[PDB]
Design a protein around this ligand. Structure first.
Ligand SMILES: Nc1ncnc2c1ncn2[C@@H]1O[C@H](COP(=O)(O)OP(=O)(O)OP(=O)(O)O)[C@@H](O)[C@H]1O
Ligand SMILES: C/C1=C/C(=O)O[C@@H]2C[C@@H](CC[C@H](C)/C=C\CC1)O[C@@](O)([C@@H]1CSC(=O)N1)C2
Ligand SMILES: [Mg+2]
Lengths: 359, 26
């Protein structure tokens, strides 16, 4: 009877039960291929295989493999029968209609859920923070968005999408690590660099001063030892890597950085709501985890915004999972129970019901 | 999450917000 919440990320699936403080299942969004099984899903592939990611930049693009991920989610991870549980799924901001329709059809016709709902990821993180109005910077493995939201509605004309996120930052770290003469080439080595990123990287409050500091001394150098004993030592790469979020030209992307796109997004909204966006800047997703990133955004947004604006960055320690937590809260609400698309409603209206019920 | 539930249940309708020019969909 308990509702299920599933946040399908480009990199990680977060799944569990509404009411819980956290997703009980977190596993890679991959299908791997080598009377053995023909494919290995999630942690199966993790534990000889070529990996495919069914979700790209937050959008489902391999439906056959996505079906495998959901099967793995229900039956192997959560160990539930989906026919017995209302299921809340997440989607990226600006997810195309055809996609949301197909998610809906597969849930009702393939998994036979009794009810379902699709929510925008960024809206859920805002809800997790106890707000229905605000602007969210949601940055994960595959995509980054600025999403201004009023009374629970993402305001689509003002949404900014940026195809720079966690995976690109890992790849960039690998690239600049070659300057010190290191070489990381395999899937397992990319994972090692992902870990270096998650452990040693940070966002400098003043990038140019930090570069000067790093040039002067060894004060910022850190070592990282692989389990095999090989050591890699890292200096200014620590902060140059996530600097890319603020200066996308670092990877050759001629696009505004995340501070500028926050400003642009707000400036596209109704004059009256702007003050409320500035005062309610919520960060969510794994790529917002860098030490210093909240401080840096506070400074940059403050530099762009009028003096009249109180600027507040909300960055809870659990923010890697804010989307899921917001889903867990939403699906457990009394007021939300009339919002589910029911099987009966799908039967009568077809997959396009998702446009009328999920917003 | 009482404060949240309150805010959600009294949200203005999509049609009204589109009519107010707040909500501009793609
Ligand atoms: N402590 C950390 N510091 C920096 N990056 C991190 C940290 N923890 C996780 N990440 C990055 O966040 C990404 C995973 O985050 P998340 O689960 O929010 O992404 P996703 O939901 O799978 O992707 P998306 O929302 O883009 O589709 C990975 O790139 C990971 O390296
Ligand atoms: C610990 C962990 C974190 C993660 O974010 O994992 C996801 C999913 C993962 C899929 C392949 C990997 C070999 C399997 C499991 C790693 C899961 O790819 C990522 O690591 C990719 C590749 S490197 C990077 O930064 N993103 C992100
Ligand atoms: Mg995500």
């Amino acid at each position: 009877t308990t509702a299920l919440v599933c946040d399908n990320g480009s990199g990680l699936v977060k799944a569990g039960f509404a009411g819980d403080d956290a997703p009980r299942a977190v596993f890679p969004s991959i299908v791997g291929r080598p009377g053995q099984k023909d494919s290995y899903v999630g942690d199966e592939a993790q534990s000889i295989l070529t990996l495919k990611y069914p979700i790209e930049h937050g959008i489902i693009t391999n439906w056959d493999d996505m079906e495998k991920i959901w099967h793995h989610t229900f039956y192997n991870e959560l160990r539930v029968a989906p026919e017995e549980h209302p299921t809340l799924l997440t989607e990226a901001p600006l997810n195309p209609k055809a996609n949301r329709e197909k998610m809906t059809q597969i849930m009702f016709e393939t998994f036979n859920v009794p009810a379902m709902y699709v929510a925008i990821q960024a809206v859920l993180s805002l809800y997790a923070s106890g707000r229905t109005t605000g602007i969210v910077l949601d940055s994960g493995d595959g995509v980054t968005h600025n999403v201004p939201i009023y009374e629970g509605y993402a305001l689509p004309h003002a949404i900014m999408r940026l195809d720079l996120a966690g995976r690109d930052l890992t790849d960039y770290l690998m690239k600049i690590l070659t300057e010190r003469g290191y070489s990381f080439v395999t899937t397992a080595e990319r994972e090692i660099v992902r870990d270096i990123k998650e452990k040693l990287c940070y966002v400098a409050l003043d990038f140019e001063n930090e570069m000067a500091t790093a040039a002067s001394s060894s004060s910022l150098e850190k070592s990282y030892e692989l389990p095999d004993g090989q050591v890699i030592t890292i200096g200014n790469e620590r902060f140059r890597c996530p600097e890319t979020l603020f200066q996308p030209s670092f990877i050759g992307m001629e696009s505004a950085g995340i501070h500028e796109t926050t400003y642009n997004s707000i400036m596209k909204c109704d004059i009256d709501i702007r003050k409320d966006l500035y005062a309610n800047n919520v960060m969510s997703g794994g790529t917002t985890m860098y030490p210093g990133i909240a401080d840096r955004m506070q400074k940059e947004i403050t530099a762009l915004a009028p003096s009249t604006m109180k600027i507040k960055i909300i960055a809870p320690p659990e923010r890697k999972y804010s989307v899921w937590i917001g889903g867990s809260i939403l699906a457990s609400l009394s007021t939300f129970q009339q919002m589910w698309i029911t099987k009966q409603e799908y039967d009568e209206a077809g997959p396009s019901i998702v446009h009328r019920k999920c917003f | 999450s009482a404060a949240l539930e309150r805010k959600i249940s009294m949200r203005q309708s999509r049609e009204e917000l589109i009519k107010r020019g707040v909500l501009k969909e793609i």
